[PDB]
Structures are given as C-alpha cells and as structure tokens.
Paper text:
The system studied was a reversibly switchable fluorescent protein (rsFP) which is a representative of a class of proteins that undergo a reversible photolysis reaction from a highly fluorescent “on” state to a weakly fluorescence “off” state. The specific rsFP used, rsKiiro, is a mutant of Skylan-NS33 specifically developed for ultrafast time-resolved crystallographic studies due to its ability to form crystals that diffract to high resolution (∼1.1 Å for single-crystal cryo-MX), high photoswitching quantum yield (∼18% Trans-to-Cis in the crystal), and high protein expression yields. Structurally, rsKiiro is similar to green fluorescent protein (GFP) with an 11-stranded β-barrel surrounding an α helix. The chromophore of rsKiiro is formed from the Ala-Tyr-Gly tripeptide at residue numbers 62–64 in the α helix.
In this study, we probed the light-induced reverse reaction, from the Trans to Cis chromophore conformation, initiated with 2 ms 405 nm pulses at a range of optical flash energy densities (0.1–6.7 mJ/mm2) after the initial Cis-to-Trans photoconversion had been driven to completion using ∼13 mW/mm2 of 473 nm CW illumination. A total of 435,200 images were obtained across 6 laser energy densities at 405 nm of 0, 0.1, 0.53, 1.78, 6.74, and 14.43 mJ/mm2. In the preilluminated (unflashed, 0 mJ/mm2) data, signals of the residual Cis population can be seen. This is due to thermally driven ground state isomerization occurring within the 10 ms duration of the X-ray probe due to laser and X-ray induced heating (discussed in detail below). We conclude that the initial population offset seen in the crystallographic data at 0 mJ/mm2 energy density of the 405 nm illumination is due to increased thermal recovery caused by X-ray induced heating. The crystallographic determination of Cis concentration at zero power density of the 405 nm laser is systematically larger than the spectroscopy-based determination. The difference between the crystallographic and spectroscopic quantifications is assigned to the x-induced heating, which drives population across a 91.5 kJ/mol barrier to reform the Cis state. A clear difference in reaction yield can be seen even when comparing the lowest flash energies (0.00 and 0.10 mJ/mm2), where a difference of 3% population transfer is determined from the shift in the minima.
Author numbering: 1 to 61, 65 to 222
The structure:
C-alpha cells in the first residue's frame, strides 16, 4: 500500500514577477498519478489582467503525475510523503530568461505547491509581451544524473500566430527532501500541456497535462 492514492487533489499558490509585473495566482485541481494526468483551475488573484502571454507560466503549474513503467525507478513517487523540490531555467531564443521553483508537500490526499516564477529581458515588441503565443508543442524531457543531481532537459517551442515557432530550452533539477531516495537511470518523459478553457484576459484558466516515462523504444 502506497502513500500516493490513485486520485489526489492539488492546491497551488504562485507568486512571481515578469519584466517588473508582480502577480499572485491560485490553483485547485485533481489528478491520477499512476495514469500520468492532472487538471487544475487557475485564478489570478493580484496583478491581473497579466500584460504577458499566460503560456510562459503553464509548465510551472509536478512529475508525480507521470505514468512510469516497472523497469524505470520513479524518483517522484518514492519522494513522498516528505516531498521534493525543483528549480528550472527557461531560455528563450530572443534573450528572455525565466527561473521557477516549486516546493511540493503532501498532507493526506492533497499535494501543496509553493511556486515562484521570475522572468526578465523579454523584448517589449516580442511575442511574450505582445501576447502572440498559441500553445506549447508536445516535447520529450531527457532525464539523467549530472553531479549527483537528477536533471531534465527539454528543447521545445511555443507556436505563435502566423505559422512561426518561438524556441525555448528548459533545464530542471529535481531534489528529494529525504536523504537516501535512490536516483533513477537515464530515461525520457513525453509530455503534452494544453489550456482547455480561459476567460477574456486569462484571469481564469483550466490547464491539463499528460506525461508518460519510457526508455526510447516501441515495445
């Protein structure tokens, strides 16, 4: 019997600053850790309407919601009940840079998330500050160990209006709270993130993510 139930609740608070614009966003959702699926309702509480593309934030709103096969060590499920934290750099092709972190805890059937998101050096004429993004392309996260730390690299892109892509490189470090959770072997995580619904200025958003771990093969 596991600390992690087939159905778990999610409670989040994000505070952040992009190009000097302060905001606070709350989230409430549910997910299925063993199926690799989560959805959540987000609401901007302060700083709305946001003057930048909501899409830059969405990967910051937990790899516990990833379907892991038996033959890959699941570092994220093994980290509970005490939990884990991640730190992420997002590097955009036009010099925009973000730093995000999440400290994740579990109380009963609920994951609590303390999220911080800091963004700077977005050009005022670029697609983030002009709100020209449409979605993230599905991508594959490469997981590996660097200097004894579990590291995930993604090379991906935002689709823009007008048949263009805006490229972004992600690097995330993941750290169990508990001393002694064994690191996994190198592997991949396929993921897809989608905004299912939104209101006029993206003050209320429903967000969905699906993630599957694998070793790079078909069988």
């Amino acid at each position: 019997m596991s600390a992690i139930k087939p159905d778990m609740k999610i409670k989040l608070r994000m505070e952040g600053n992009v190009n000097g614009h302060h905001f606070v966003i709350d989230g409430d959702g549910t997910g299925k850790p063993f199926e690799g699926k989560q959805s959540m309702d987000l609401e901007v509480k302060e700083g709305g309407p946001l003057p930048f593309a909501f899409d830059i934030l969405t990967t910051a709103f937990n790899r516990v919601f990833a379907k892991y096969p038996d033959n890959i060590q699941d570092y994220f499920k093994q980290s509970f009940p005490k939990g884990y934290s991640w730190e992420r750099s997002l590097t955009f092709e036009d010099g925009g840079i973000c730093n995000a972190r999440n400290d994740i805890t579990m109380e009963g059937d609920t994951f609590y998330n303390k999220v911080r998101f800091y963004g700077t050096n977005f050009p005022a004429n670029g697609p983030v500050m002009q709100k020209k993004t449409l979605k993230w392309e599905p991508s594959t996260e490469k997981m590996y160990v660097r200097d004894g730390v579990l590291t995930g690299d993604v090379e991906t892109a935002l689709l823009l209006e007008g048949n263009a892509h805006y490229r972004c490189d992600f690097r995330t470090t993941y750290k169990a709270k508990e001393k002694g959770v064994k690191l996994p072997g190198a592997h991949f995580v396929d993921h897809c993130i989608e905004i299912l619904s939104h209101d006029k200025d993206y003050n209320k958003v429903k967000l969905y993510e699906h993630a599957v771990a694998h070793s790079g093969l078909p069988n």
